[PDB]
Amino acid sequence: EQLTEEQIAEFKEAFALFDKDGDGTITTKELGTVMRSLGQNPTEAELQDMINEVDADGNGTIDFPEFLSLMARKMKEQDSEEELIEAFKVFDRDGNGLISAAELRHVMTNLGEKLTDDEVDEMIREADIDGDGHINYEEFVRMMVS
Ligand SMILES: [Ca+2]
Ligand SMILES: [Ca+2]
Ligand SMILES: [Ca+2]
Ligand SMILES: [Ca+2]
Ligand SMILES: [Ca+2]
Numbered sequence: 001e002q003l004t005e006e007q008i009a010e011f012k013e014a015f016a017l018f019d020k021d022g023d024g025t026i027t028t029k030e031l032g033t034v035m036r037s038l039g040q041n042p043t044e045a046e047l048q049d050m051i052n053e054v055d056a057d058g059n060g061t062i063d064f065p066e067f068l069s070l071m072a073r074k075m076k077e078q079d080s081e082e083e084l085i086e087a088f089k090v091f092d093r094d095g096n097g098l099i100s101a102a103e104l105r106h107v108m109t110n111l112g113e114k115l116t117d118d119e120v121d122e123m124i125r126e127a128d129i130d131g132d133g134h135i136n137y138e139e140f141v142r143m144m145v146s
Pocket of ligand 3: 055056057058059060061062063066
């Protein structure tokens with residue numbers, strides 16, 4: 001058990017948008033063509049780093065198996081990111097990109113923990129890097145995963 005025929009089809013369709021000449025490989029050049037379509041014009045050096053990070057057999061191009069592997073890991077990654085984003089948005093009651101002491105205390109109460117200002121301030125101090133007395137998304141993630 002790993003993937004359905006439909007999943008593999010969608011993986012192939014995506015690979016094809018990179019493999020411009022259908023040779024079964026994505027090169028630095030082909031990756032460049034796609035990115036240039038998306039508004040980025042990376043250097044050959046930048047493209048080669050992008051390939052080297054995922055070309056497992058060090059053969060210089062990415063094959064469909066190599067793509068499946070990097071895709072599956074990116075998707076799981078994005079699942080985790082999304083959970084963190086949705087949580088940050090539960091806490092950032094006003095959406096200004098920062099969890100304040102008042103916001104955190106409000107959400108904690110509803111989460112079942114009726115906290116004092118001193119307690120919530122200590123929580124924030126633990127996570128606060130830029131010293132602004134608020135928890136911004138990076139600070140939230142860094143604490144939640146470490
Ligand atoms: Ca190709
Ligand atoms: Ca660049
Ligand atoms: Ca390869
Ligand atoms: Ca806020
Ligand atoms: Ca902060």
